[PDB]
Design a protein around this ligand. Structure first.
Ligand SMILES: O=P(O)(O)O[C@H]1[C@H](OP(=O)(O)O)[C@@H](OP(=O)(O)O)[C@H](OP(=O)(O)O)[C@@H](OP(=O)(O)O)[C@H]1OP(=O)(O)O
Lengths: 68, 834, 49, 117
């Protein structure tokens, strides 16, 4: 009947190792979504940079001609 | 010794190089057969390809005693010696025994019992060195933990069990509860050294197959491709990687080297354990990196180890990126210069202070045969034994009533929460009690610290934890509620703030001494060593989620914890290691370079020895937006009368540019200075304290301003200077009229990298037609805007060809961003280092 | 070494660490012809001094 | 400080000044065109950074597949059963008759054979 007491130990031990992997799952998911969030922000800038640059291409030509 | 094999005597005994050997011809006699002891060699008959006989190894009793006496010598030579120095000698002795004898040791049970005895003795030498005559306060983790985690890094050959209890860790939940976490023997070193049988048979096949792989290299006359051997690299009794040893054009001539290293015993008084090998001829015959990594795993991983240490008291967020300080000045130098045996042993104690402090929650754990509960004065710490230096170390942490100062701060920080929730909790008032100053560390009993009076009573829950999200909230009604806040300083045996908060609550609420003004309240507990928090008691509606939220906010930002945390860190010595478009913005920015400032030339003499002559140099200060260049020549007269010249040269670089900056109007002074050598940041900082508006940044990109000395307009000008004159230049030879600053800037970088590679090929590139000239009012040859592009392409190809030659890579493998970054000198070398 | 003064039995040679020497000994010993035969009373004696 | 030779080669004809003090007390439309030209490189640098961000998704997306979905969730699923198996093994026991012992060891040995041994 001591084995019954041993089980409560191994039950706690196993459950308490299980706690770590659960948290480990939470940590992995957290990193990915911040990147999803963060990278979502970065690709929103990609249009804006396209709009800038193309306008500068015109305004390069325009200013260079205008001042001459 | 004479040993005789016959039809009567079947064991052919012999004893060579310390290996006691018994041969049994198993084709003849059958007393033992193919038993899987590790240390039995199988004698393959070479012509019949049969296991005709077995050889049983042992370590001979002569070399047992040579080993035993080496451990005795280490124990005798202890005294005032650091624990690291002791175990470094143990490790060296143990590696020496093991890497020599290998599988002979494990067949020699009388050695293994000795190895257990010696290892335990080294441990006990450390235990008694910390005045701790008991097992419990010294569990395995203190010794075997690798020494970059501040353990001793002891190696083992014992079946040293790691207690299953000692692997747990705990982390604070945001809910205010605590989750325990987790992830057997400590590893024997023996499994990490390849046994000699495997080494020999693998050495035959490896060097045999190398001859075939060289026959391919011979047949094709190709380069001996190391890619053909990368699986073989750490094989062979001579390690095959010694074939590529850069010294090997000499090591071919060091003949008779093995006997030479043995006769050193008559020449050098210091015994050498690796007398039998030489890393340049044998190669390194063992590699123990896997032992270090696996040892962390056996001890529970970094999170499981660090609970045994005061790390959680630092409240660093993570272990990675932390480092341990060393300097050797004052630690060792002053003891060499000004020895005094009774006093200067306190300097040798500096690592032991750090070590004992670091392992405090283990070495001062309450689980003891005896000890005493010596409470530290003015403090809640208990000092269960007279551990030599932990007492003074902890006093310096909690100096000047820090224990009380913490407790009052958390009590009043709670007041500043209650003062803003009165109506929501239906509180008529909250009282900070007249807490007696002892109360913060009188551990045997307590008062209420904060008292709540209801507006018209609340219903009140049965006693429960802050982690218990559900409550029997209709159990009773009461209109007075108390909070008791109790600090704690845990140890690895006891830092569970959940069970602590319960047990102290249940005790005090039944104890007669407890000055509690109501039958219902909570006890709040804080483990100040682990930064854990908890609460237990009765709860009225809205109280539990407030304390849960409020307590975390306190732990995150309270100032009294911060001064404690810094004191722990400053005691542990343990510290944390913590743009291309910007150059052309409307600010004023100077690049500065110090590499050309102090220069020395070498020549032969009539004495045959060389001698050093200093020569004139220059500080190089360049504005990349405007192209303006300030070339402050530094003349050899400033080195006269001094000998610490290199540090003086660093000081004089920062000083002379500060003198220039201080003379110029603030509308022309920089606002950022970008410095091409990180060693120059700090003398500039201490010199530019008078101008806080200037930010100073390390360049991190590499700009080769050292190469400008190859330009004759600079070389002769700087060499032939008679005084430390200033010379002003512009590197943009009118380019800012016809091209932009960036391409003009990039052109300078292309030209500078070019002449750093080769001036003359650059001059060839800069002279595409022989009719081109350099005008005296210019620095570069006069070229058209398209001709400048043509020479830029030649410089770009020249840079990449030199890069490709230096790295064995095709230029066509490089993208437009990579070739740019190569021009910027960024760290492109391998993907494993970015 | 160039002139081959020492014959190959002179040990602390550059090519064997002493544990390999023990191996080449017992490897070379076992390779001897009829070395384990004792039918007619043949004996091996190894002498070390 | 006040009497150290300054040689000036920045202009088309040479000048000499007695020192820093004598030196220290001795368009923008075109400049802005140069600025305009630089901004073209800025988006070029950012597009290349966006290519690195593109590879950053490859790192992140393989962490989803390999690290979270395969490695973590699989070992989760296996051992979380083993917890409940071992809890179930604990549940089985107590005060049997003869046939209750048979059903116990039938149950224990058939269902939980590793734990039984
Ligand atoms: O490590 P052990 O030999 O099993 O002894 C411990 C120890 O007993 P002491 O009271 O004599 O020290 C514990 O005390 P600490 O090391 O924490 O000071 C105690 O914990 P409690 O004081 O809370 O009882 C624990 O008790 P338990 O087995 O219930 O955890 C108890 O075991 P024993 O009471 O059987 O000696």
């Amino acid at each position: 009947e001591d084995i019954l007491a041993k089980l409560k130990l191994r039950i706690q031990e196993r459950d308490e190792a299980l706690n770590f992997r659960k948290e480990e799952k939470r940590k992995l998911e957290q990193n990915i979504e911040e990147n999803k969030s963060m990278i979502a922000k970065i690709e929103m800038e990609l249009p804006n940079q396209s709009t800038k640059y193309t306008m500068y291409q015109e305004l390069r030509v325009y200013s260079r001609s205008l001042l001459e | 010794f004479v040993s005789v094999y016959s039809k009567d005597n079947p064991n052919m005994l012999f004893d060579m190089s310390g290996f006691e050997c018994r041969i049994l011809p198993k084709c003849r006699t059958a007393n033992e057969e193919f038993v899987h002891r590790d240390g039995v060699w199988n004698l393959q008959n070479e012509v019949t390809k049969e296991r005709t006989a077995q050889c049983f190894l042992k370590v001979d009793e002569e070399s047992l005693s040579k080993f035993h006496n080496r451990i005795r010598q280490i124990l005798m030579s202890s005294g005032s010696t650091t624990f690291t120095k002791i175990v470094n000698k143990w490790n060296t002795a143990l590696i020496g025994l093991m890497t020599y004898f290998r599988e002979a040791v494990v067949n020699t049970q009388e050695l293994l019992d000795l190895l257990v005895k010696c290892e335990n003795k080294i441990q006990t030498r450390i235990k008694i060195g910390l005045n701790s005559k008991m097992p419990s306060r010294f569990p395995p983790v203190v010794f075997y933990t690798p020494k970059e985690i501040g353990g001793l890094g002891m190696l083992s050959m014992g079946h040293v069990l790691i207690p299953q209890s000692d692997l747990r860790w705990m982390q604070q939940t945001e809910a205010g509860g605590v989750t325990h976490f987790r992830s057997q023997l400590i590893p024997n070193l023996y499994r990490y050294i390849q046994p000699w049988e495997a080494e020999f048979v693998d050495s035959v096949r490896v060097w045999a197959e190398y001859a075939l792989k060289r026959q391919e290299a011979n047949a094709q006359n190709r380069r001996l491709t190391l890619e053909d051997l990368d699986d073989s690299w750490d094989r062979g009794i001579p390690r095959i990687n010694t074939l590529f040893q850069k010294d090997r054009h000499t090591l071919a001539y060091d003949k008779g080297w093995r006997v030479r290293t043995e006769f050193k015993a008559y020449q050098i008084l210091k015994q050498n354990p690796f007398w039998w090998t030489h890393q340049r001829h044998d190669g390194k015959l063992w590699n123990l990196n896997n032992y270090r990594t696996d040892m962390i795993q056996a001890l529970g991983g970094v999170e499981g180890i660090l609970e045994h240490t005061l790390f959680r008291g630092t409240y660093f967020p993570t272990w990675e990126g932390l480092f341990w300080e060393r300097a050797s000045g004052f630690e060792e130098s002053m003891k060499f210069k000004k020895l005094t045996n009774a006093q200067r042993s306190g300097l040798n104690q500096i690592p032991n202070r750090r070590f004992t402090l670091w392992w405090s929650p283990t070495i001062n754990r309450a689980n003891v045969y005896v000890g005493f509960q010596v409470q530290l004065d003015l403090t809640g710490i208990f000092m269960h034994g007279k551990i030599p230096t932990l007492k003074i170390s902890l006093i310096q942490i909690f100096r000047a009533h820090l224990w009380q100062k913490i407790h009052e701060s958390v009590v009043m920080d709670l007041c500043q929460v209650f003062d803003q929730e009165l109506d929501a909790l239906e509180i008529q008032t909250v009282q900070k009690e007249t807490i007696h100053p002892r109360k913060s560390y009188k551990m045997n009993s307590s008062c209420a610290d904060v008292l709540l009076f209801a507006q018209y009573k609340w219903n009140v829950s049965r006693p429960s934890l802050m982690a218990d999200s559900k409550d029997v909230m209709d159990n009773t009604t009461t209109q007075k509620y108390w909070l008791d806040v109790q600090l704690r300083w845990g140890d690895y045996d006891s830092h569970d703030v959940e069970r602590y908060a319960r047990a102290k609550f249940l005790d005090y609420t039944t104890d007669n001494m407890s000055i509690y003004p109501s039958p219902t309240g909570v006890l709040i507990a804080i483990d100040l060593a682990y930064n854990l928090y908890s609460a237990y008691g009765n709860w009225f509606p809205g109280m539990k989620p407030l304390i849960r939220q409020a307590m975390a906010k306190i732990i995150k930002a309270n100032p009294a914890f911060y001064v404690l945390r810094e004191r722990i860190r400053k005691g542990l010595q343990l510290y944390s290691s913590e743009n291309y478009g910007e150059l052309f913005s409307n600010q004023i920015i100077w690049f500065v370079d110090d590499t050309n400032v102090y220069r020395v030339t070498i020549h032969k003499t009539f004495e045959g020895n060389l001698t050093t002559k200093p020569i004139n140099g220059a500080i190089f200060i360049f504005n990349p937006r405007t192209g303006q260049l300030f070339l402050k020549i530094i003349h050899t007269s400033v080195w006269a009368g001094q000998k610490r010249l290199s540090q003086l040269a660093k000081w004089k670089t920062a000083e002379e540019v500060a003198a220039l900056i201080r003379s110029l109007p603030v509308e022309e002074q920089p606002r950022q200075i970008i410095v091409t050598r990180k060693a120059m940041l700090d003398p500039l900082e201490v010199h530019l304290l008078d101008f806080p508006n200037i930010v100073i940044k390390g360049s991190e990109l590499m700009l080769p301003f050292q190469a400008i000395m190859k330009v004759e307009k600079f070389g002769d000008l700087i060499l032939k200077a008679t005084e430390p004159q200033m010379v002003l230049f512009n590197l943009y030879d009118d380019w800012l009229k016809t091209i932009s600053s960036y391409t003009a800037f990039s052109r300078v970088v292309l030209i500078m990298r070019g002449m750093h590679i080769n001036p003359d090929k650059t001059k060839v590139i800069l002279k595409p037609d022989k009719t081109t000239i350099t005008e005296p009012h210019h620095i570069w040859p006069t070229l058209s805007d398209d001709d400048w592009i043509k020479v830029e392409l030649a410089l770009k190809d020249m840079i990449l060809a030199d890069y490709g030659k230096k790295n064995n890579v095709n230029v066509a493998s490089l993208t437009q961003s990579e070739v740019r970054d190569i021009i910027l000198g960024m760290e492109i070398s391998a993907p494993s280092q970015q | 070494d160039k002139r081959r003064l020492f014959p190959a039995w002179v040990k602390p040679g550059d090519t064997e660490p002493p544990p390999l020497l023990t191996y080449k000994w017992c490897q070379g010993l076992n390779n001897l012809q009829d070395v384990w035969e004792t039918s007619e009373g043949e004996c091996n004696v190894i002498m070390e001094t | 400080y006040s009497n150290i030779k300054v040689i000036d080669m920045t202009g088309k004809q040479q000048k000499i000044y007695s020192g820093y003090d004598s030196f220290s007390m001795k368009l923008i439309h075109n400049l802005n065109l140069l600025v305009d030209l630089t901004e073209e490189g800025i988006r070029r640098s950012n597009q290349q950074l966006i290519s690195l961000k593109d590879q950053t998704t490859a790192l992140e997306y393989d962490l989803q597949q390999v690290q979270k979905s395969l490695g973590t969730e699989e070992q989760e699923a296996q051992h979380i059963k083993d917890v409940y198996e071992l809890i179930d093994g604990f549940s089985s026991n107590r005060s049997p008759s003869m046939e209750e012992c048979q059903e116990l060891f039938r149950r224990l040995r058939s269902e939980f054979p590793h734990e039984y041994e």
